[PDB]
Design a protein around this ligand. Sequence first.
Ligand code: ZN
Length: 257
Amino acid sequence: HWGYGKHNGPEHWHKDFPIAKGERQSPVDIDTHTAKYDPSLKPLSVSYDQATSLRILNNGHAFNVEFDDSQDKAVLKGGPLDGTYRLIQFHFHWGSLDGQGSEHTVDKKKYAAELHLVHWNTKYGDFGKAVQQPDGLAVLGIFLKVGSAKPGLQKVVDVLDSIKTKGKSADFTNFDPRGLLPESLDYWTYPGSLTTPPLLECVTWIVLKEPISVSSEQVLKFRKLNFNGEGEPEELMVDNWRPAQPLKNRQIKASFK
Ligand SMILES: [Zn+2]
């Protein structure tokens, strides 16, 4: 099955998921000079005050922090979006070294990592139905650079020893995802896809301009995770990012001048 190796990585995905070569694939390079300021775009509304985290899972490609999405507790609205999108999970993509790891790039700059907060449109009732629709998901992408520690990330870092290998999960209640946001909600937006199989073209991407800073020790703990299951040969979970895909007939819009 698919992964990030020489034999099963992004350039192989098209064989099982032909949409890999589709017209609205993610991620993309954000050319900051070509992105158009769109004064009609609304400020993002991030309403995470009542978020209920439940669990953290090593799924063999990343780790997911899962939320209760059975009510409107943690929602994204406004920005480019029509209606209400419920937070279901967040995860990261990161590198083997600090010079790579993000999926989106900015003028070809690669960040050390990228956080994806995944939300689904409540008009489709469940995540599985939402991924079948062109406006089904809104993913909030946040870049990570290495410098100062991010205090709000440390609870995540400290549980990773308990989910080292594929299929391990741990209770992860009372985590506040507000602690992962930068100060500014200035963003770019474009229509795209899931960045892992099944690569469905169901995402409104919202990529924040302002990165968050994490410490070298925090990202080093990400890199101690394993792709493999328990009692299998150790394969470090690093470089779990898809490279930039062709922009094709798309416009990236900026919320800011
Ligand atoms: Zn992702």
